[PDB]
Amino acid sequence: TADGPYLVIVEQPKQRGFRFRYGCEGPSHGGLPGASSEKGRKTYPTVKICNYEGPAKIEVDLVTHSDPPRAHAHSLVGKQCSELGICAVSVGPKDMTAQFNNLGVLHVTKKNMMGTMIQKLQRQRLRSRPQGLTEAEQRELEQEAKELKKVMDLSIVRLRFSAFLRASDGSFSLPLKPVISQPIHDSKSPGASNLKISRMDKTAGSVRGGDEVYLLCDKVQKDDIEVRFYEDDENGWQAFGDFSPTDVHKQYAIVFRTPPYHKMKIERPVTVFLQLKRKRGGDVSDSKQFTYYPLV
Amino acid sequence: TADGPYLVIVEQPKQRGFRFRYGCEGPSHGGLPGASSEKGRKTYPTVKICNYEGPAKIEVDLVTHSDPPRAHAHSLVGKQCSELGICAVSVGPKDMTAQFNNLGVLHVTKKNMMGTMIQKLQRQRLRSRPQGLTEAEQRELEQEAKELKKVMDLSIVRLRFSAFLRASDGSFSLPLKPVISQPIHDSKSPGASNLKISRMDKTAGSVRGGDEVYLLCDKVQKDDIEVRFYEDDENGWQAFGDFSPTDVHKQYAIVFRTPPYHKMKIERPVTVFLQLKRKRGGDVSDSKQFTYYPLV
DNA sequence: GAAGGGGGTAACCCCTTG
DNA sequence: CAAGGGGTTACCCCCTT
To answer: What's phi and psi for A13, nearest 5 deg?
Structure first.
């Protein structure tokens, strides 16, 4: 869209299913993969400097989930990283694409958060006056920290890629616009699991409903879940599972009774969809097929 | 059951399903119940002084699981307790039975264990030499502590009732033999809750086996557990569920295929039992009935 | 409200496998 | 080791009478 040189995320990170590691857990536990990684094909976050060919330097750091992108308490740890959480690669005059195949997220302790925060905030405001730092600003620097620690989500981070075109000097000194990735959720964090149907005991029934199904899923909250049956033919037929939270077994299974199909006296089987749906959210699981059958 | 007065545990504590509380959790989280408590009928650990009627003092403290009963790092907390973990009641000249209806177990931190240990050990060896404790004696007492902390199970405790018959003095100075209860497992610990079958999708099958059942459980260790089918000591015939640990869905469910019954073409249907059984241990869930059907 | 239960959350500690 | 994963502790809350 912009005429000038710019960075583009070729492959965003995994928005779900990456674990943030604490300082104690040990240094390599896996690298942040790409949004299209599977067991066979692994992919990693990738970016490219479009609208220029030449030597250049791309760096990533963790920013808040909040759109005004501020530095996160969390740091990137990796084979290619600063001890501030800043990861740096060099793109060759031919290859303008940077893959970041070994990126970890160091999870800060809540009792660590302030000091880690003032430390990244100092580092940030050192270019304005590198010789020395005044109390007059150290007081107000600590003021950001406190206000940020109150609202900062330790479960969600965003990669921020900052590209720098090496100048005539030999100095990698020219900035490009910084490009912020989609959010990255901690896999080991409260709720915010993607609703998954592992398997079900029945995939067929009668048009009459009332057929009892055992559904195995990933963690669900007994009071926030439902089982939506539907046909997305724009008729927009929908009905629901019949159960009580007691029927939701230790947040990993649902025993429900199928609803009746809208139209009985059907002559042939009809395939519909069912899906888990959080009422409190909008969030849905992958839909599975269910086939209604005719009568007597 | 010899000549003299002795104590007897009328109602032992619940060997499973009691939670030990840390110092931080609070007081008043519930009392150690008797082995026969239900939500309607509550019962608490009870003991009686046999072969004597008169004023007497019974005290309870936590001892190791190890047969040589040594004092546990854990302390009893409650309305009737010392700050050392010693709980004391008085039995009247009429009623020689003592109920302990509010007993909590204060869980020591592993970094607390040493100091709590030397402190209970001093208290133990303070009537042996109350004047002072000699430096020479100090280091031998500290040794016990270290070699006891290495093998002491913080998940299992035993109540030790020490009864004392009050003399003519007014001094509760006569000892009875101390009676040690059966072990008490921390509910919140590795394998110390009860294997439970919540519900199953099928309670009947064919003699041929291979019928797929969804079983909902309380918890499982995925590669620990099995599904034992068996007869009522007809011969003790037994067979097993067919499933991989992949089939055990997240510690709360098992999808298995029923085994074939030993004798096919049974003229009419046969009811057998199935049960969860830890492969490692002996431990079994409550058995559920399953009915085999003949062929056609 | 406190008692009397129970479940979730942070931080860490591990164990499988290559 | 790397790359996942699950389980453990100490603590923090939260429902119900």
So the answer is: -75, 165
